[PDB]
Design a protein around this nucleic acid. Structure first.
Lengths: 77, 80, 272, 67, 203
RNA sequence: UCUGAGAGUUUGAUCCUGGCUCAGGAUUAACGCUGGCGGCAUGCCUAAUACAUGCAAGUCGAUCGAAAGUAGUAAUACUUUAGAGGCGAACGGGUGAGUAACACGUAUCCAAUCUACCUUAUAAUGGGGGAUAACUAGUUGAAAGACUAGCUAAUACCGCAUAAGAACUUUGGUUCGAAUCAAAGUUGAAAGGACCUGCAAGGGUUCGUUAUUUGAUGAGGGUGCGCCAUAUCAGCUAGUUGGUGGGGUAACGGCCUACCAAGGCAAUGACGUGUAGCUAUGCUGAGAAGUAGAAUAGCCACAAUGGGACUGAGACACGGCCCAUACUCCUACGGGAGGCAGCAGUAGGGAAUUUUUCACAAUGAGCGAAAGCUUGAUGGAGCAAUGCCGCGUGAACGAUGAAGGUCUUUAAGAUUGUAAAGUUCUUUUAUUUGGGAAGAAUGACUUUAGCAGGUAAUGGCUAGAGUUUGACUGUACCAUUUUGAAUAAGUGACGACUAACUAUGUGCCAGCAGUCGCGGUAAUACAUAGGUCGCAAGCGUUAUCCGGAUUUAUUGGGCGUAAAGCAAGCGCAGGCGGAUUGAAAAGUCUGGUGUUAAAGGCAGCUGCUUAACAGUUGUAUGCAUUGGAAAC
C-alpha cells in the first residue's frame, strides 16, 4: 500500500513554518517601504527578498513585479 | 509489448520519457523484430540523430543494437 | 409471498447443496414445500439461517393434502346445450347414468342402440369426461377409475358443434354431481413403530386418537414392532406428538398402504 | 419488474401455467387479439414445454428426439 | 457437410459426378431420377432463376467438398484481384491441394486425398501438411514423405488415372510440380459460372 | 478496371397515391436444442450501490546519527531498517454521473506563459552558527500510543563574503501594443560524498550541489470555422458591461478590490428545458449520408458527497492534509480506524457476460555507481461456442436393391441404399515411450586490447570471450512411440412469399404464423411418421442500427380530383435579380509549402503448414500561407 507518506506528512509542516517566517519578514520590509519611500528601505527589501527569490518559496516573477512596483513610487519623487 | 501474443513487437519510436507505451510521441525511427534476430533492424540512421540531439535518449535496451548498427560512434562525436 | 417463495427456493437449493440433512418435495396439489424436519427446532434453524443471512420474511404453513372422490350411483341426468353462437347452430342433449367402480379403471359404454348420435361425435366427449375426471363438482378432488355409460343422447343434424358435447359433459356432471353428495377416499397408510415396550401406552393412545385399529402388540421376539393403520390427514402433528411421548426414543417409517373409505366426520369438512 | 405490465400469448399444445409463476417474456406479435405483442417462451425458470415436439425444438422447449 | 459419407444421393439428384461416371454400377436399378420418395413424375415446386442458381451453386460446391462459409471467404479474397473472375474462381478453387492431388493421379477422389493429407501422409516445402486449404503458388513442388509411400491405393492409382495438362509429375518418385493455371476448355465442366457469380450477394 | 436485383398485400377485375412485412449484413449481445479441435479476438450496456480479507509506489547506507548480527582483544569487512534527509509518489490503472461549453476536433497566436529532472557551453564548487528526530528518562494503557525533560549529525536549516552572467532603475544604440545593445547604481552562491596517486604535500578522477546559458519536453492561456433536439422555451443578465488606481495569478485580463460610467447578447433562436463523454473510427450504403461512439489510442471530467488549503517544478491530488455531511467498522466504551468508478472477489439488480491465479523472462517507470529492489502496468495461465478462422466424426471395393421402416395404401414393386453386411488402407484427434528448441545473446559482472581532454594512477566509450537470467512448457515440432475406424452430428424448413412432398390421427376443436392466411368430416399450411432439402460444430429465436426505402427526395418527391397552395392583401429583414466596361480577387479553378497522430479503411509485399492474423511499403478528404486565371 503505502509506507513512507507520513514522512512527507510531518516533513512539510516545519518547512511551511519556515516559509511563513520568510514571507512575514518580506511583508514587514514591504510595509516599512510603504510607510515612506527612500533608497535604504528599497535596498533592505532587495537584500532580504532576493534570498527568498533564490529558493522555492516565491517565484522570481512576483519578486520582479514587486520591485518594479516599488521603484515606480521611488521614481515618483 | 505490442502486436501479437507469442509474436511480440516494439517499434523504434522517438519519444520523451514522460508517458506510457503506445501514446504521444514525436517521430517513428524504425522497428526491430526480436522474433527473428540476425543482426538486422529497421533504422533510418538520419532522424535518430535529430532525436538524440534534442535529448530524450532512447530506451536502455537498444544501446547494444545501436552500437551494432553504428550509431553510437557517430553520436559521441559531439562530446569529442 | 411468491417472491419470498422464489428466493426461498434459491436459498434452499444451495442449502441442500451444502448441508445434506433433509429433503425437499414439491407436489402439484397446490404448490407446497414438504420439508424433512427433526422437531420444531429443525424448521426454526431453517428460518433463522434464511432470514438472518438472505433477508427473507416467511411464515410456515399447515400440512395441506387432498382426498379422492366417489359419489352415489345416480339414475338420470339432463344435460342441455342451448345457444345461438359460433356462426352456426349449437346444441347437445346428454343423459348419462354415471357409475363409479373399484375393480378396474375407466371404460366407456355406448347405450345408443338406434344411432341417434353419430359415432364420430362420441370419442371427443369421452375424452371430455377423461378431461373432467381430474376436477369434480365440489373442489376438483381426484376422480380415479370411474366408468361412464352414455345411456341416451341427441344432437342437431346440421348443427350441434362437437365441442359443445364435451362442453356440456362437465355441465350436467356438475349439477347431478352436486345432488350426488360424494363421499371421500382417504389415503390410509401403515406405520411401523419399534418400541422397547415401556412407553407404548402414550403411543397406543395417540394412535387410537388418530382413528386407528389397535388391540394388542406384535413383537419381533425381543422388541415390539407394531403396525398401525393411519389416515394421512393428521399424521404430520402425530410425528412430533409420538416423538415427545417416547422422549424421541422411538422412530418410524412411512409407507403407502392404499386408499380407504372415509367416515362422515371427514366428509363434513370437505367444504367450508 | 419495471413499470409497465402487459399481456402475452401462450404457445404450444397444452400449458403449464396456472397462476403466480415467474417466466420469460420475449418480443413478438400475434394477430388474433388486440394489443398482444409478446410471447411467453417456454423452457424457462418455471414453465416446462410440449415434451414431444421434435420438429420444432428450439422453440417450445423440449429434449432431443427420442432415442 | 465437410465429410458427407453419402455422395450417391447427391449424384442421383443432380445427375452429375465428381469422376467421369462411376456412381451407377447397376447394383440394382440404375435410375437417374431424384433419390428418396417424391414421385417419379414430379420435378420441383419452384423453378425460377433462384432455383437454378442455387442448383448450380450446390453442384459446384459439392464437386469440391467445400463448406459455404469458406466459399464466401474465397470469394472475398477473389474480389481483391481483378480480371475475368468467372474463370478465376475456377482457377483458384482448383489450386486447392486435393484438387491438384487428383490432377496428379495420386488419388481418385478429393475425399480420399483429404484423408491422406490430414493424417500426415504428404510433405510440401519440407513442412508437414494436414489441410488442403493451401493457396498453391506457381513454382511449387510436393513430396510424399517416403515413409508413407507404401500406401497401396496411391501406388495402384498412379498409373490408372489421367494427368491434367497444366501439371507435371515424376510419378516414379511420386512427386509432382505445378506448371501453370488451369483452363476452362481443358477440364470437364459445363457449369454456368455466371450464376455462381451473381447468386452470392454478401458482397 | 471500378459504381444501383426484387416480391407480397386494400378492390368482381384493373390503374394510381400511400403504409407494413419478407429476400442483406452486424454487434459490449441472450434464450432452447445440442456439441471434436487449434489460433486470433472479446467478455457489467443496467446500480458512479455498499463493499469482508490479502495484494496494488516505493527507493537511496557509495547521504547521516542511532541499533543488531556474522568472525576479529580494539580497529574493522559486510546484511538490515525504526528515524532524519534526498528523489519519486502530480506517473501508470480504471470509470463515464454531471458538463450542450473554446470542453472536445481543427488551423493558429502567446510584443502575455513556467518548464526540476535529459541535451549545449559557462561563472563555480569559500567560510561559520544554531538546530531536532531515533535514543535516555518520567505518566497512561490490553496493546495502542501520545504527552513531558536531556543529548546528538549531515547533501536538513539559518547567517558571514566573493561574482562572469542574471534581476532591478538613469544615460545612449534601437521595433511590426512592445524589443534589441552600451556605461552606471543595486543585489543575491552553495555541500559535500566515493576513489586514486602520493610518508605527510597537493592534485586528479566519479556522483552531486549553486548561479547560469542552450534547445527539446510537457503544461497553461484567447480567438477563426465546424461541432444534439426543443418556439407547447421572448426577452436573459447583474461583476453583468467599460475607464481609471491598487492587489493578485506562472503570466494577460472585473480575476479581486475603491471610485466613476450603463450596456452586452438576442427572432440569423439568447435564455430555459430534455438528452449526451468528445475524436480517429466500428457497422451499413456505390455515394452523398445514417447509426453507435465496446475494445485500442488523445483530451477533459470526477475519486463516498461538498468545501478549502499545505507540499513540491508540476495537485487543489484514484489509495496526501483539515473541516462539514451521509454511511460504515472496532473497542477493556477511555477513544479510534475506513472509503475496490486499482486486480481478482462478494452482496443486489438485471435475461446476462470470467479465477477471491503464476512472475517481473520481454518492455516501461522510481531510486541507486552498481549486485539490485517495488511494479494487480505488464507478460502469462484459466474460465467463458462470445465472435472469426482452419480443422475432424475416416477413405477406396462391395445387390436388379440384406432385414426392416415408409410408401405403392390394390400385394405385384419402389424407397431408405454403397449408406449398410462384409473386404482393404490409414491414424488429424485419441493412448502410451523419448528427444525436446525459439521467445534473451537483451543488462550487468570478470578477465583482454584500444580511444579520448589526462595522469603517477583511477575512472567514462568502443571491440573480444566466459557467467548466467524462460513464469510460460512434459508448449510447438518430430521421433521402428503402442493400439485400433476406432474416441467423436446437430439444427430449421418442405402451400406461395424464398428450396425441397406423401401417408396417418385431428373435424372452426385441439391447434398454427414475419406476410398472404389454413383447419365446419381429403389439412401437402395443425400433431405425428417416412423421405427430402438450407446451414453447420454450430443451427435456429426474439432487440437494437443500416440496406431494401428517392419512406424527409442537394444527390433523388410533390401540392386540380388521393394527405398537401395559407381567405385575400400591404409590406420590415432575408433570398434571388436588365446590359457594357474597369479594378482587385470575397468564393471558385489551379500550383508549392506546413498541418490532417498511432493503430484502423483500401492496394502490394513478408512470416506464421495455410487461410484467420500481425508487420511493412504507400494512399485518404480538411485547414492556413504563398503565386497565377478573371468566365461566373
Amino acid at each position: 500500500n503505502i509506507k513512507s507518506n507520513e514522512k512527507r506528512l510531518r516533513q512539510n509542516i516545519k518547512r511551511n513554518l519556515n516559509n511563513k517566517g520568510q514571507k512575514t519578514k518580506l511583508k514587514t520590509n514591504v510595509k516599512n517601504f510603504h510607510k515612506e519611500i527612500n533608497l535604504d528601505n528599497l535596498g533592505n527589501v532587495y537584500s532580504q527578498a532576493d534570498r527568498l527569490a533564490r529558493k522555492g518559496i516565491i517565484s522570481t516573477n512576483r519578486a520582479r513585479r514587486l520591485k518594479s512596483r516599488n521603484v515606480a513610487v521611488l521614481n515618483k519623487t | 509489448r505490442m502486436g501479437r501474443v507469442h509474436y511480440p513487437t516494439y517499434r523504434i519510436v522517438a519519444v520523451d520519457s514522460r508517458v506510457k507505451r503506445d501514446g504521444k510521441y514525436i517521430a517513428l525511427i524504425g522497428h526491430l523484430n526480436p522474433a527473428l534476430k540476425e543482426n538486422k533492424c529497421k533504422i533510418d540512421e538520419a532522424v535518430a540523430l535529430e532525436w538524440l540531439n534534442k535529448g530524450a535518449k532512447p530506451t536502455d535496451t537498444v544501446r547494444s543494437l545501436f552500437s551494432q548498427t553504428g550509431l553510437w560512434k557517430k553520436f559521441v562525436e559531439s562530446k569529442k | 409471498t411468491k417472491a419470498d417463495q422464489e428466493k426461498m427456493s434459491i436459498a434452499l437449493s444451495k442449502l441442500a447443496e451444502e448441508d445434506p440433512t433433509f429433503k425437499t418435495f414439491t407436489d402439484p396439489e397446490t404448490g407446497q414445500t414438504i420439508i424433512a424436519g427433526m422437531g420444531e427446532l429443525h424448521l426454526d434453524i431453517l428460518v433463522d439461517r434464511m432470514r438472518r443471512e438472505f433477508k427473507v420474511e416467511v411464515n410456515v404453513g399447515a400440512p395441506q393434502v387432498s382426498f379422492r372422490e366417489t359419489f352415489n350411483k345416480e339414475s338420470e341426468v339432463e344435460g342441455k346445450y342451448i345457444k345461438q353462437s359460433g356462426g352456426r347452430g349449437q346444441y347437445g342433449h346428454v343423459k348419462i347414468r354415471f357409475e363409479p367402480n373399484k375393480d378396474k379403471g375407466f371404460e366407456f359404454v355406448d347405450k345408443i342402440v338406434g344411432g341417434r348420435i353419430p359415432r364420430e361425435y362420441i370419442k371427443p366427449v369421452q375424452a371430455g369426461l377423461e378431461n373432467a375426471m381430474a376436477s369434480g363438482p365440489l373442489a376438483g378432488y381426484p376422480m380415479i377409475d370411474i366408468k361412464a355409460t352414455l345411456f341416451d343422447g341427441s344432437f342437431h343434424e346440421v348443427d350441434s358443434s362437437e365441442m359443445a358435447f364435451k362442453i356440456a359433459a362437465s355441465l350436467a356432471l356438475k349439477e347431478a354431481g352436486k345432488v350426488c353428495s360424494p363421499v371421500l377416499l382417504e389415503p390410509i397408510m401403515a406405520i411401523e413403530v419399534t418400541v422397547p415396550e415401556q412407553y407404548f401406552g402414550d403411543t397406543m393412545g395417540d394412535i387410537s386418537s388418530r382413528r386407528g385399529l389397535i388391540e394388542g402388540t406384535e413383537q419381533r421376539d425381543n422388541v415390539q414392532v407394531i403396525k398401525a393403520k393411519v389416515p394421512l390427514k393428521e399424521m404430520f402433528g402425530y410425528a412430533t406428538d409420538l416423538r415427545s411421548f417416547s422422549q424421541g426414543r422411538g422412530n418410524y417409517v412411512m409407507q403407502f398402504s392404499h386408499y380407504a373409505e372415509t367416515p362422515k366426520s371427514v366428509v363434513n369438512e370437505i367444504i367450508a | 419488474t419495471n413499470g409497465f405490465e402487459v399481456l402475452t400469448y401462450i404457445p404450444g399444445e397444452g400449458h403449464n401455467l396456472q397462476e403466480h409463476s415467474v417466466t420469460l417474456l420475449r418480443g413478438g406479435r400475434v394477430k388474433d387479439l388486440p394489443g398482444v405483442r409478446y410471447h411467453i417462451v417456454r423452457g424457462t425458470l418455471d414453465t416446462v414445454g410440449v415434451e414431444k415436439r421434435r420438429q420444432q425444438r428450439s422453440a417450445y422447449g423440449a429434449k432431443k428426439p427420442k432415442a | 457437410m465437410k465429410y458427407t459419407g453419402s455422395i450417391f444421393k447427391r449424384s442421383r439428384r443432380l445427375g452429375f459426378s465428381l469422376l467421369e461416371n462411376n456412381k451407377e454400377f447397376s447394383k440394382g436399378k440404375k435410375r437417374k431420377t431424384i433419390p428418396g420418395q417424391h414421385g417419379n413424375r414430379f420435378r420441383s415446386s419452384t423453378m425460377s432463376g433462384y432455383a437454378q442458381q442455387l442448383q448450380e451453386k450446390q453442384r459446384m460446391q459439392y464437386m469440391y467438398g467445400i463448406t459455404d462459409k469458406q466459399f464466401r471467404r474465397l470469394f472475398r479474397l477473389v474480389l481483391k484481384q481483378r480480371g475475368n473472375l468467372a474463370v478465376n474462381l475456377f482457377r483458384v478453387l482448383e489450386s486447392r491441394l486435393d484438387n491438384i492431388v487428383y490432377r496428379m493421379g495420386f488419388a481418385p477422389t478429393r475425399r480420399s486425398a483429404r484423408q491422406l493429407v490430414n493424417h500426415g501422409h504428404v510433405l510440401l516445402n519440407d513442412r508437414t501438411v494436414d489441410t488442403p486449404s493451401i493457396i498453391l503458388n506457381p513454382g511449387d513442388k510436393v513430396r510424399l514423405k517416403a515413409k508413407t509411400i507404401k500406401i497401396p491405393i496411391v501406388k495402384a492409382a498412379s498409373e490408372s488415372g489421367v494427368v491434367s495438362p497444366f501439371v507435371e509429375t515424376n510419378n516414379k518418385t511420386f512427386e509432382g510440380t505445378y506448371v501453370r493455371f488451369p483452363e476452362r476448355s481443358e477440364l470437364p465442366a459445363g457449369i454456368n459460372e455466371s450464376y455462381v457469380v451473381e447468386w452470392y450477394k454478401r458482397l
